[PDB]
Each structure stands twice: as C-alpha cells, then as structure tokens.
Amino acid sequence: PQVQFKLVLVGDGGTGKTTFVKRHLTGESEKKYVATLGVEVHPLVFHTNRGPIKFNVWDTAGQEKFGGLRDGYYIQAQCAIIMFDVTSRVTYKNVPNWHRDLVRVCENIPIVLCGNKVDIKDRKVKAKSIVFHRKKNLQYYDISAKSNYNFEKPFLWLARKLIGDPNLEFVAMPALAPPEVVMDPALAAQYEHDLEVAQTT
Amino acid sequence: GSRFALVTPKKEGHWDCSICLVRNEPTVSRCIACQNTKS
Ligand SMILES: Nc1nc2c(ncn2[C@@H]2O[C@H](COP(=O)(O)OP(=O)(O)O)[C@@H](O)[C@H]2O)c(=O)[nH]1
Ligand SMILES: [Mg+2]
Ligand SMILES: [Zn+2]
Numbered sequence A: 001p002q003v004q005f006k007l008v009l010v011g012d013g014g015t016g017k018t019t020f021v022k023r024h025l026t027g028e029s030e031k032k033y034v035a036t037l038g039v040e041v042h043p044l045v046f047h048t049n050r051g052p053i054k055f056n057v058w059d060t061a062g063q064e065k066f067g068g069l070r071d072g073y074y075i076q077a078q079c080a081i082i083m084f085d086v087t088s089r090v091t092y093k094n095v096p097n098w099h100r101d102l103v104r105v106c107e108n109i110p111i112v113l114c115g116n117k118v119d120i121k122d123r124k125v126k127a128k129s130i131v132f133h134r135k136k137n138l139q140y141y142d143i144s145a146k147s148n149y150n151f152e153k154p155f156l157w158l159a160r161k162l163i164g165d166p167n168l169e170f171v172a173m174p175a176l177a178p179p180e181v182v183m184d185p186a187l188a189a190q191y192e193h194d195l196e197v198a199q200t201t
Numbered sequence B: 001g002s003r004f005a006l007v008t009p010k011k012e013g014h015w016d017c018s019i020c021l022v023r024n025e026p027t028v029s030r031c032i033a034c035q036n037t038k039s
Helices: A017-021 A025-029 A089-093 A095-106 A153-163 A185-200
Strands: A004-011 A032-034 A039-048 A051-060 A079-085 A111-116 A139-142
Touching: A004 A017, A004 A095, A004 A153, A017 A051, A025 A039, A039 A153, A051 A153, A079 A089, A079 A095, A079 A153, A089 A095, A095 A111, A111 A153, A139 A153, A139 A185
Parallel strands: A004 A051, A004 A079, A079 A111, A111 A139
Antiparallel strands: A032 A039, A039 A051
16 A cells, blocks of 8 residues: 556657666566566655655557557556657657657646766757757756666656655665766766756746 | 655555556456456
C-alpha cells in the first residue's frame, strides 16, 4: 500500500532513455518485463520529506525506432518524460510528435522535457533553440544519463506537481550507478547559465 | 513533514497488476494497460 505513479519515458530511439532509467540501481534490480507490450517497468523509489514516492517508469524495448507506440503503453500514465539528444537536431524536431501522441491518450498529465547527452562537448541543440516547453506548460532540464547529471530533477519537479506541494524535497539522492563519464563542472555551469538567460528572453 | 505524511492509497477491490503495476478498478478482471488477467 504505497504511493506510486506510472511514468512513461518516450522519445526517439537512441536518445538515451534506457541508459537514463537504468542509473537507478534498485529500479534496475527490481524491474518487471511486460511481455504483451514489450516494456520494462522500473520501480524507482525516491525518499521525500513527506515519505517515499515510487515512479514506475515504462521503458520501451526499442519499438519507437520503427513506428508509434501502442495505446496500452500510454494507458493510465500519470506523468511523462520526453527525451531528445542534444547532439541530434532531428530528435528535438520530433519532440512535438511525441507530445501529441502523449496528450491524445493521457491529456494534460505533467510532462518534463529532457535534453540528454550534454556531457558531449560538440553540442548541436543549445539553450537558445529549446523553446517547445515554454509553449506547452512543460519543465525542461539538461541531463547526462552517463554522468548522472541532473538525474533527480525531472522526478522532483514531477513529484511536486503530482502531490501539489512546491516545498517537497528529496532527503537523499537514490543509489545510482557510478558515472561512466565526467560532467565538466564549468560546462554544466555555462549550460545552466545559458538556460537562465533564455528563460528571460 | 510528519504531520503531512503522504496518504496511503485506500483501495477496496482495486488491484495492482502484478505484471505492469497499473492500478485497476474492482469491476475489471483484466488489466486495461497490458491486458493480462488479474494475478
Ligand atoms: N556521451 C553520452 N552518451 C549516452 C548518454 N546516454 C546514452 N548514451 C548512449 O546513446 C546510445 C543509445 O542509448 P539508449 O539508452 O539505448 O537510447 P534509447 O534507444 O532511447 O533507449 C547508446 O550508445 C548510449 O551509450 C549520455 O548521457 N552521454
Ligand atoms: Mg531503449
Ligand atoms: Zn498490467
């Protein structure tokens, strides 16, 4: 008898969705395979100041590379993450298609937009170009799955929206797989600055 | 905080699908997401 939410993780193939969800070690060890839909559900626990929350994150088995996803994948989703790859403009271009497919089934669930792979120096999709979230009442974050950079931020924002408590906090980070790449602290600060001045403009 | 501990889901007849973890209504015997029968 525990608080939990179905979270659907969508985006073009190759954007890092599986790598991202896999950072949460317990969500990986306790994942559940859904053979009818071809999905791995990762139960991700986060410990908040008001108790534990579990995000049951639905990760595809790659079917997104060849067409749209079936209704059952989206059914009863209570939140979502839309991911793209900041080194591939086409994956950003397709964000509106994923958003559309989402709201067709689930309507106005809270959604976070995530630009992944910001550990890669040669960034193609920069803060100035990232505007789809401003138009649709979505939050955005840069992320780097392979370095755990900003891993908790999508989930914290979603938790605050779902619970209706802007002061909700995580009392500790979840146990995450050790970083495979280093996220340069200066590049991270630069990017965080780039996103701020673009919110003003 | 403690005075506002998150309220446990109170579910009478509602069941959590053991395959995909979606919550289903008491009336249905088959999960509306993954279409597996209650288990
Ligand atoms: N440099 C870097 N590479 C990543 C990152 N996330 C994923 N990759 C790689 O991008 C490729 C696709 O990863 P995957 O998780 O399978 O993408 P998916 O198809 O959306 O699930 C893989 O070779 C990953 O190693 C990241 O954050 N930084
Ligand atoms: Mg994948
Ligand atoms: Zn099910």
